[PDB]
Amino acid sequence: NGIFNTRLSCTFGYTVKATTVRTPSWAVDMMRFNINDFVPPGGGTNKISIPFEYYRIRKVKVEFWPCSPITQGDRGVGSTAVILDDNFVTKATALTYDPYVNYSSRHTIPQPFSYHSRYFTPKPVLDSTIDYFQPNNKRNQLWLRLQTSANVDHVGLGIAFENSTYDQDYNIRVTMYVQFREFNLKDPPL
Amino acid sequence: NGIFNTRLSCTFGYTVKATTVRTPSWAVDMMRFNINDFVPPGGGTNKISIPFEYYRIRKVKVEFWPCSPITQGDRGVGSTAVILDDNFVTKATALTYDPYVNYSSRHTIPQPFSYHSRYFTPKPVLDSTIDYFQPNNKRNQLWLRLQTSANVDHVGLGIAFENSTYDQDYNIRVTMYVQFREFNLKDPPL
Amino acid sequence: NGIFNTRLSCTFGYTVKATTVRTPSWAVDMMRFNINDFVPPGGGTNKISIPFEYYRIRKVKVEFWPCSPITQGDRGVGSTAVILDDNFVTKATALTYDPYVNYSSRHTIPQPFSYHSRYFTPKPVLDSTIDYFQPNNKRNQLWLRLQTSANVDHVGLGIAFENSTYDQDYNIRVTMYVQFREFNLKDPPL
Amino acid sequence: NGIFNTRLSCTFGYTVKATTVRTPSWAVDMMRFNINDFVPPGGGTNKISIPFEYYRIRKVKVEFWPCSPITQGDRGVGSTAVILDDNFVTKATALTYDPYVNYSSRHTIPQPFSYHSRYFTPKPVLDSTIDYFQPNNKRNQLWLRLQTSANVDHVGLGIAFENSTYDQDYNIRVTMYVQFREFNLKDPPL
Amino acid sequence: NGIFNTRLSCTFGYTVKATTVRTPSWAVDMMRFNINDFVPPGGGTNKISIPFEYYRIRKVKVEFWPCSPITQGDRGVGSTAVILDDNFVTKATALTYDPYVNYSSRHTIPQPFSYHSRYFTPKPVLDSTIDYFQPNNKRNQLWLRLQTSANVDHVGLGIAFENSTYDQDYNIRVTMYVQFREFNLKDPPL
Amino acid sequence: NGIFNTRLSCTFGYTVKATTVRTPSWAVDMMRFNINDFVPPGGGTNKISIPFEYYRIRKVKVEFWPCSPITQGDRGVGSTAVILDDNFVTKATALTYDPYVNYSSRHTIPQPFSYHSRYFTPKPVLDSTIDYFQPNNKRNQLWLRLQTSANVDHVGLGIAFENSTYDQDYNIRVTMYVQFREFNLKDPPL
Amino acid sequence: NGIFNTRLSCTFGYTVKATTVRTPSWAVDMMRFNINDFVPPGGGTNKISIPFEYYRIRKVKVEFWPCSPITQGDRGVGSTAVILDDNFVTKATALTYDPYVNYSSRHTIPQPFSYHSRYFTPKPVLDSTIDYFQPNNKRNQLWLRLQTSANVDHVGLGIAFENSTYDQDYNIRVTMYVQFREFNLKDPPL
Amino acid sequence: NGIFNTRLSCTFGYTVKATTVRTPSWAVDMMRFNINDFVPPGGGTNKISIPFEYYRIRKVKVEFWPCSPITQGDRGVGSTAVILDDNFVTKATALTYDPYVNYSSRHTIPQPFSYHSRYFTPKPVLDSTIDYFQPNNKRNQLWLRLQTSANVDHVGLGIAFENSTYDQDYNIRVTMYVQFREFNLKDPPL
Amino acid sequence: NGIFNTRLSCTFGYTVKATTVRTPSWAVDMMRFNINDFVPPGGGTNKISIPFEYYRIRKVKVEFWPCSPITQGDRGVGSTAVILDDNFVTKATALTYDPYVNYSSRHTIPQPFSYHSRYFTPKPVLDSTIDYFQPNNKRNQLWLRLQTSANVDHVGLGIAFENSTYDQDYNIRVTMYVQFREFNLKDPPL
Amino acid sequence: NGIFNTRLSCTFGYTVKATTVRTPSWAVDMMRFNINDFVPPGGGTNKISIPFEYYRIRKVKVEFWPCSPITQGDRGVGSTAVILDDNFVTKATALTYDPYVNYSSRHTIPQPFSYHSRYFTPKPVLDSTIDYFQPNNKRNQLWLRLQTSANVDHVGLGIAFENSTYDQDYNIRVTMYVQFREFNLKDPPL
């Protein structure tokens, strides 16, 4: 009966640069989520402070939180999608158009004080040449050995934002769903 | 009422090298999906062009698209799985056997003109020592602060491909599902 | 009718360091899952051995497996969550407290011989400035071109572990769910 | 008709140390929850200010709350699981790998602004030699005498976090579900 | 077919001190429940008298039992909650106010002859730095090795009590639900 | 939308001493599960490697795993229960009788190669004087601040074992379910 | 995810005076239930031992317990009702008649060895001039700050008893249902 | 079979003072409901005329009754809510604004000839320091000993009223739901 | 058709004293909720600013809110219950044990950043000698006349908290459900 | 129509020895239940006073009953499981760890005043070499001849208890479910 799990989370911060061009214009950065951000290092008998064998993530619920007010206008839309391709559309300071209107995971979220989410499922990556992705299959999804600092990257959440001449502020809530494995609690003598 | 979202996507390209060995043989690369590929940089008042606080990815629907024809044979199978382990089975130019027949997320997809998908859920990573993965829990999954270029990697989609002496071509569609947060639209004066 | 998929998996290994401090204390590493770990390189006509066009991961089922025995005590809890934030809570050798009690994806899994899982959905990342995450939307999630070694990171599984003065051992099972695309099997002449 | 209960809660704070190593790396501390934190001392006719006979906890709903913003990146995943083993995987400042990918309660929660939860059930502990755990049985679960300061420890929530070079901040919400017993309200004379 | 379990229980006793101040006032102690109270030491071929490998607790049903009579008045309320935070609100002989009115697990139980319960789920703790908690996930919750006397603490049941100038008496019933593992019954020769 | 979680787990080991007395006889140790076993210490910007704010454990699924064979006889029963009382029945090397036949959480699990589980819910503890336990209430259960090494104990799993003249061996799997909170991922400059 | 709670209870004692008049005659006292009876005082970092922010009581289950035997006759009825009026019908040593036959919450419970209960919902009071009572609405019911000793009174349970020339004895069980709030566990340094 | 109950009720009267200020303005008093208003004193063999052991209130149905006519205008609204906080918003003769528009239990009831109700559940209070409130849990709610005149206060019903320059009149109906306990009817000899 | 109601609420504050004793220890204060806190005084034609006749409270939903962070550890549990006994278990600065483990309304809520609730029903009190409590009966529950400042106490929410050496902070939300009665709006001439 | 049965029960007593070691530690004894304890000897025409032919036990409902109070703390967990192995994990006075965390029938029951149960099914044993156990099959389960004093042993209930430095007391309730057979009532002449 190897069934046990709980809720794990952190926070972080990134910003899109405030522009000078008035145009309806979009801004890009990637989001890997590799677990070296997310396992603290332990000590003594063990090395990192979630020291188990095999992990897989069940679901992804990524919460949004604005510090931007209801007063703030020049109002536009932000974006968030599911991307799994390993070959990236171009990040720039200013790109001519929006390619996002012709891709698979298009939603609609306004700016600046909007908060929303997406509920989906990630996959791990081992070999760079193939990068093949599974169908929607929970029970036959792979597990792998937990590693120290060479744990595999996991691209987690698409993001895009309307650019204008102003500033905004936001907090970041990421709640993921990890099933844990191999109870082997270490009991030293003496 | 912080509920708002939309569909975000991009595209990219990678290739497995065309071989000289006739054997049933397999090829590997990892797939992180870190959001620096997926948020464009904005300007002026803000920095990246999806400048919100907290993100999590709901689901993953990674679409396949072949440029390979129905005529092309020597026909074999490709592979795609969910991997969440942070400690990788070996990539090579040619490995002796297939370990994939003994892991958790095994599906069956043919080659070369086949297109399919997998529907699953990712998790973010903070600490490298632990890398523990949640159970299948949407509502209690973590959110974190959006960061500029040090956003966390997210290993997204397993891939493996049968190797032979020929070439193939493919396009890549990645539709992810991101819920957005913290409406704080920036209104400058003057 | 571009619907075909199968189960893909690997394994890996990481450790949290065994400590000298007796306190209830936690340990962190990130987990990206970038697909260069997960596609083997092919040869001849093609380059990596899952050489298709477009991928997305359906779900994530990350299995746990302990080598730790039922005898091993000083017993505590490990952790695993869904994180999608791209801005990381601090990894250390020893941090003063646990911030994990105040985040979105909190579950409960004991130590040391415990094994569990999480069932969720990842997203890909293109642009670092935005990193916006989709809502829970499968069918409108993005696909992108498979790339050779610059495939996008995917942050896959949160992890955290109770630290004490002992050792533990664990194996890692990662089963992901990748839908595959673009049958273009390569048939050379001669 | 001895059926009566209500909602009891507190708050606390712990931190994972901010690191210098860039690796995907994990961090660990234990979480007991012994009730001496959770019963205030009374006076006069009675001693602690919840002075009843027999307690058991029905469920556990541990809420997450980030002070980390949506801007904060380098984004990874945190972790949270259910651990019940009494023999601990090693806490360290930096452990080599993540054992959490091979255990029973793996979920996926991102970092840094993510907030999530886990819904599960604890057990009390009397004898150190055995530490046997019940099946999922509510009505035939044990009750014991409330004690003054030697009340038994209860390991409550697994946690693990991705480690990097930055700081984060978090608040902690713990809502537990305790059924109360033995109305014997004390009426002094005079 | 590793499915077998039964009902395990004990009893104990603690008291809140009888006060001199008339005010509506509250009293606190923590409740860990570490399994060294709950496994008796065996002998001969084995060491503690529940000598198995891996444990997790399914649920918590903590029964209340008063020795206080129906006659006893000055009547007030007691409290019991689910706390999972690892950072404690302050115990005192007399604190100025009640913070409990602003937390997650608030119920209502009277005093002095009242008896009630709470039905919830615990988690184990390994690493002090993280202490991340799972979502409500049974099957993917972790197992760990049973240890001798360094078994991990488990914080089990919140408690708080109205303080006045009188005495009360109570018995304590704790019924927990532990699933057992690894039949390896020891048969010596001779 | 602060919902994200994953699966967290560890392992440990404890033993009941092998006896010389032939009698049907029982053995005891407590099981706290405090999260300092279960959060690894991070570094740099943060302290433990699951560095979030608020945690609670959803459920407890504690898996059993024997190293004892099917051949091993002199066959008896082990025990595992839910205890939430904070006042302990007596641990000894040999106690005269079994009080466990008269408590709330009695199940039946054989020895030596048996493996089973219990599915229940823990609570946190703040104040030692009260230690009141909630009713079975998920949504109104408390959250608290994650702390560094003074995180609260959580008594997690009752255990008891039949004693005889032989040895046994067991591994320990603890999968807990922790919901995570407060995405505040830390992005340093420079 | 601020949902956590548990069961809290106490006991007390009051008596109706044994009379000399043979008539069918009734006896009255009020029942406030102010939480200063029900939170024990803590120490050190905090003041009362359930030190949270906001409370509300979900339900009321007030259990009855007689010490009176089945032999005891001259048999009559007792009474218990829900009163919410803040302006009281007259208490006396002997009143001429029973006004209780013409009010809203009339039930029927015999004397002397009878035990029963009532299941209903309380409200808090702030301003004496108004004292307006809500409709049956759970989710839109108010929360307020927990106070030290000036916490607001809560009138909890109506009671009335048939008077005759004999003595009786009773114990008192009060199980209330309190949802708890604001995990802010206090971690001192040093 | 200790199940028996009936309907208990009384009446009382309070007034809000008739003002001179024309403004939309509000008026406050607290409502405890302590059972000394609600148990009559008996004689002879017993002391109060509902002389049982343990009580808890099931529900609260507080009926409204106006003596104000349908003719009476200057028409405004009154208020009634559920308050459980033990720390009070300020009563005055005239306060500047209405804080009630930002709290948990807001309903809408007009003035002056309006009559309505609220259906909810109270809790008892023992210790002033904690004052923690249960979740919505009937069967595990506490019972306590009935006391003579030091029975615990129970804050019962929030009230607020629009103030103007006129008079009104009202009657008060309070029907509560009390379950009774411990049949021990007293039979004297001679 | 005398059916009308709305949501009424306030806030307040109390604290449990921060201790010097390390033990798992509990803290108590009572919670009455008398409506003089909750009706503001009016003027002119009327006296308090909710000037109606008859009130009863439908339900109680007492929300928790922590100012304690997710970082704060030494983590324990708080408590909250339903108490209806009018005879109180002893408040102290430090009581020897926890009687709350043996009463009717036990739930489980952690500390310090936990927030939860309880959903239950209060009763009013008239006569101190009896204090009998109704069964779970809404429609036959009593109403009584609203009074000026002698409105009856209502014991509202049990609370108990784990005590340690640190500080915490909390806000208090109390939403109650009051049905209102007797439209007699006062229209002066001139 | 050979269908007739009724309820049969007894009581007994055993104790775990009170220890000197503070550790979380466990204690073990076996529980056979051979029917020579459970058939009284008759006389005259027959020999034992349930003198029928064939028996089998339908189910097992083993009730717990504590004499330990709600005051008693140092609180831990007890254990109870289903064991069917005939080769025993080691009983000792003190064993190093808990193997119970890695076996099949793990539940969670607290200590000391907890009471719970387990509902399961036994089997008879004839030949020591095999000791094979049936699947869950009622109707095809074996019957055998009732014997005088060489009736076959039946291992009935696993037990394990947390050990500490204190005493506890408990009563034992065992209700089993035996179907009876072969009406052959003996009628002597004369």
- Three-state secondary structure of I63-119: EEEECCCCCECECCEEEECECCCCEECCCCCCCCCCCCEECECCEEEECCECCECCE
**What residues of F are in contact with residue J27 (Cβ under 8 Å)?**
16, 26-29, 91-92, 95, 160-161, 163
Q: What technique was this entry resolved by?
A: cryo-EM
Contacts of residue A2 in chain J, CB cutoff 8 Å? none
Cβ partners under 8 Å of residue E73, min gap 6: D185, D187, G12, G13, G14, G29, G31, G172, H35, H145, H146, H147, H148, H149, H150, H151, H152, I85, I86, I87, I88, I128, I131
Residues J79 and B106: their CA atoms lie apart, in Å, by 39
Q: Which residues of C touch J (CB under 8 A)?
A: 69-73, 75, 110, 113
Task: Give the residue from chain I lying closest to G105, CA to CA.
Answer: I141
Other Cβ atoms within 10 Å of F23 Cβ, number = 15
* Contact criterion met (CB below 8 Å) for F118 and E143: no
Phi and psi torsions of I4, nearest 5°: -160, 145
The pair of three-digit structure tokens given for residue A14, joined into one six-digit string: 């990134």
Sign of the CA dihedral with G19 first, then G23, G24, and G26 last: negative
Measured distance CA(I27)–CA(E29) in Å, rounded: 6
Which of G38, G91, G106 would best serve as a mutation to test chain H binding (most H beta carbons within 10 A)? G38
The amino acid sitting at D120 is: F
Q: How far apart are CA E108 and CA I80, in angstroms?
A: 6
Scored b (16 or more CB within 10 A) or e, H80-113 reads bbbbbbbbbbebebbbeeebbeebbbbbebbbbb
Most E CBs within 10 A among G141, G174, G186, hence the mutation to make, goes to: G174
Nearest CA in chain E to B136: E137
> What DSSP string runs through J105-143?
T-B-BBSSS--B--EE-------TTT-----S-STT---
Compare CB distances from D124 to J66, J77, J98 and report the shortest one's residue.
Answer: J77
CA-based nearest residue in chain F for residue D158: F38
* Residue of C91, C156, C82, C80 lying closest to C114 (CA atoms): C80
Select the residue of D8, D10, D15 nearest I112 (Cβ to Cβ): D10
Closest to C113 measured CA to CA, from A119, E144, D125, E184: E144
User: What gap in Å lies between CA A174 and CA C105, rounded to an integer?
Assistant: 7
8 A C-beta contact, residue C92 and residue A166? no
Phi-psi region of B182 (alpha: psi -120 to 50; beta: other; left: phi over 0): left
- The DSSP 8-state label assigned to residue D20 in this structure reads S
Distance CA D2, CA E168 (A): 17
Distance, C-alpha G123 to centroid of its chain: 12
Smallest Cβ–Cβ distance between J27 and the set F73, F116, F160 belongs to F160
Chain B / chain F CB contacts < 8 angstroms? 105
D near G: at least 3 beta-carbon pairs less than 8 Å apart: yes
Task: List b or e across E82-99, with b for residues whose CB sees 16 or more CB atoms inside 10 angstroms.
Answer: bbbbbbbbbbbbbbbbbb
| Phi, psi dihedral angles at H100 (to 5 degrees) | -60, -20
Question: CA J158 to CA E6: how far, in whole Å?
Answer: 7
Unique residue bearing structure tokens 């913290």: B182
In the 8-state DSSP scheme, what is residue C152? P
In angstroms, the CA A152 to CA A147 distance is 9
Whether E143 contacts J101, CB under 8 Å: yes
Distance (Å, whole) CA E4 – CA F118: 9
| CA G63 – CA D64 distance, rounded (Å) | 35
For chains G and H, having 3+ Cβ pairs within 8 Å is answered yes
CA distance G148 to J73: 26
C75 closest CB neighbour out of J96, J101, J103: J101
C-beta separation of C154 from C178 below 8 A: no
Residue E179 to residue D83: CA distance in whole angstroms: 13
Strands (DSSP E) found in chain G:
7-10, 16-18, 25-27, 35-36, 44-48, 53-66, 77-79, 109-110, 119-120, 127-128, 143-145, 160-163, 170-179
Strand partners, F161: F27, F78
Cis ω for the linkage preceding F69 (within 30 of 0): no
Letter for the amino acid at C149? S
Q: Are F115 and F105 in contact (CB under 8 A)?
A: no
Q: Is the dihedral of CA A51, A57, A60, A61 positive or negative?
A: negative
Per the CB < 8 A criterion, the answer to whether F138 and E121 are in contact is no
Q: Measured between alpha carbons, how far is H103 from I11 in angstroms, rounded to an integer?
A: 8
Cα dihedral F18, F21, F26, F32 sign = negative
With CB atoms and an 8 Å threshold, state whether F142 touches G177.
no
Angstrom distances, CA of residue H77 to CA of G123, H74, H159, I183:
20, 10, 12, 10
How many CA atoms does the CB half-sphere of F49 hold within 13 Å? 78
The closest CB to that of J97, out of A1, A183, A187, belongs to A187
Q: E127-158 as b/e, with b when 16 or more CB fall inside 10 Å? A: bbbbbbbbbbbbbbbbbbbbbbbbbbbbbbbb
DSSP string, E139-186: TT--EEB--SS-PPP-B----EE--BSS---EEEEEEEEEEBB-B--B
Half-sphere exposure of E180 (CA within 13 A, CB side): 53
Helix (H, G, I), strand (E, B) or coil at D38: coil
Instruction: For chain C, list the strands marked E by DSSP.
Output: 5-10, 16-18, 30, 44-48, 54-66, 78-79, 101-102, 119-120, 143-145, 160-161, 170-179
CA distance D3 to chain A (A): 29
Contact I122, D72 (CB under 8 A): no
B99 Cβ neighbours under 8 A, 6+ residues apart: B89, C10, C11
Chain A's closest residue to F9, CA to CA, is A180
J137: CB partners within 8 A, 6+ apart: none
HSE of A47, CA atoms in CB hemisphere, 13 A: 26
The answer to whether the CB of D65 falls within 8 A of the CB of D170 is yes
Q: Which chains reach chain F with 3 or more Cβ–Cβ distances below 8 angstroms?
A: A, B, C, D, E, G, H, I, J
Q: How far is CA A58 from CA C103, F133, J137, J147, in A?
A: 17, 31, 36, 56
- Chain A neighbors of C157, CB-CB under 8 A: 35, 38, 55-57, 122, 124, 154, 176, 178
Residue C98: φ, ψ to 5°: -110, 110
Q: Do C15 and D62 touch (CB under 8 A)?
A: no
Rounded Cα distance between E161 and E28, Å, is: 7
Closest residue of chain F to E106, computed from CA coordinates = F140
Both tokens of E30, joined, read 């923590």
3-state secondary structure chain H: CCCCEEEEEECCCCCEEECCCCCCEEECEECECCEEECCCECCEEEEECCCCCECEEEEEEEEEEECCCCCCCCCCEEECEECCCCCCCCCCCCCCCCHHHHCCCCCEEECCECCECCEECCCCECECCCCCCCCCCCCCCCEEECCCCCCCCCECCCCEEEEECCCCCEEEEEEEEEEEECECCCCCCC
Contacts of J164 in chain E (CB under 8 A): 36-37
Give exposure, B65-102, as e/b (b: 16+ Cβ within 10 Å): bbebbeebebebbbbbbbbbbbbbbebebbbeeebbee
Amino acid at G152: V
Does residue H66 contact residue H75 with C-beta atoms inside 8 Å? no
CB G41 within 8 Å of CB E20? no
- Cβ contact A176:B56 at 8 Å: yes
| Bridge partners (DSSP) listed for residue F172 | F64
CA nearest to J104 within chain A: A1
Residue contact C101–F183, C-beta within 8 A: no
Residues in CB range of G90: below 8 A, 6 or more apart = G28
Does chain I reach chain B with at least 3 CB pairs under 8 Å? no
For strands A109-110 and A25-27, give the pairing: unpaired
Query: Quick check: I9 and I176 in contact, CB under 8 A?
Result: yes
With CA atoms as reference, report the closest residue to G104 among I142, C25, F38: I142
Residues G134, H81: Cα–Cα separation, whole Å: 4
CB A143 within 8 A of CB C65: yes
Q: Angle at Cα J78 formed by Cα J76 and Cα J81, nearest 5°?
A: 150
- To 5 degrees, how large is the angle CA F142–CA C117–CA C179? 125
| Tokens representing residue H33 in the block | 């409901």
**What is the DSSP code string of J67-85?**
-S-SSB-B--BEEBEE---
Tabulate helix, strand, coil % of chain F (nearest 5).
0, 40, 55
**CA distance linking residue D106 with residue J50, whole number of Å:** 54
Residue in chain G nearest H129 by alpha carbon: G48
Cβ count within 10 A of residue F35: 74
β-sheet bridge partners, residue A164? B44
State how beta strands C160-161 and C5-10 pair. unpaired
Instruction: Write the DSSP symbol of residue D17.
Output: E
* Residue C139 buriedness (CB in 10 A; 0-12 / 13-18 / 19+): middle
Measured distance between the N- and C-terminal CA atoms of chain I, rounded to whole angstroms: 31
How close does chain G come to I77, measured CA to CA in Å? 9
Q: Nearest by CB to H3, which of G116, G161, G163?
A: G116
The radius of gyration of chain B's CA atoms, rounded to the nearest angstrom, is 20
**β-strands I78-79, I160-161 pairing:** antiparallel
Report how far residue I138's alpha carbon sits from residue I135's, in angstroms, rounded to the nearest whole number: 9
CA geometry: angle F12, F15, F17, nearest 5 deg? 170
Closest I-chain CA to H152: I86
Tokens linked to I154 = 């209502």
Choose among C96, C97, C101: nearest Cβ to G183: C101
Q: Residue J82 is nearest to which of E6, E147, E154, comparing CB atoms?
A: E6
How far is the C-alpha of E144 from the C-alpha of E141, rounded, in Å?
10
Distance between CA atoms of residues I171 and E104, nearest Å:
11
J128 burial class (0-12, 13-18, 19+ CB within 10 angstroms)? exposed
Which chains reach chain G with 3 or more Cβ–Cβ distances below 8 angstroms?
C, D, E, F, H, I
- What is the Cα gyration radius of chain C? 20
Q: Which of F1, F7, F58 to probe the A interface (max A CBs under 10 A)?
A: F7
Query: Which residues, in sequence order, are bridge partners of residue A47?
Result: C17
For the beta carbon of residue G69, count every other beta carbon within 10 angstroms. 16
Say if residue C189 is exposed, middle or buried (CB neighbours under 10 Å; 0-12, 13-18, 19+): exposed
Q: Contact J81/J26 with Cβ under 8 angstroms? A: no
Residue J60 token pair: 């097992």
CB A52 within 8 A of CB A180: yes
List the single residue in G57, G142, G149 with the smallest CB-CB distance to I120. Answer: G57
**How far apart are alpha carbons D78 and E130 in whole angstroms?**
8
Q: Are E30 and D8 in contact (CB under 8 A)?
A: no
Residue F8: alpha-carbon gap to chain centroid: 13
CA distance D138 to D180: 15
Coil, strand, or helix at residue B101? helix
The answer to whether residues E162 and I31 touch, using CB atoms and an 8 Å cutoff, is yes
Q: Rounded to whole angstroms, how far apart are CA atoms A148 and A143?
A: 16
Touching chains, D (3+ CB pairs < 8 A):
A, B, C, E, F, G, H, I, J
> ∠ CA C3-C5-C8 to the nearest 5 degrees?
165
Instruction: Count CB neighbours of G67 within 10 A.
Output: 18
- Chain D nearest CA to B31, separation (Å): 15
For chain J, the straight-line distance linking the first and the last C-alpha, in angstroms and rounded, comes to 31
- In Å, what resolution does this model reach? 6.7
Chain E CB contacts of C111 under 8 Å are 124-126, 142, 144, 152
- Mutation pick from E61, E113, E167 vs chain H, by most beta carbons of H within 10 Å, is E113
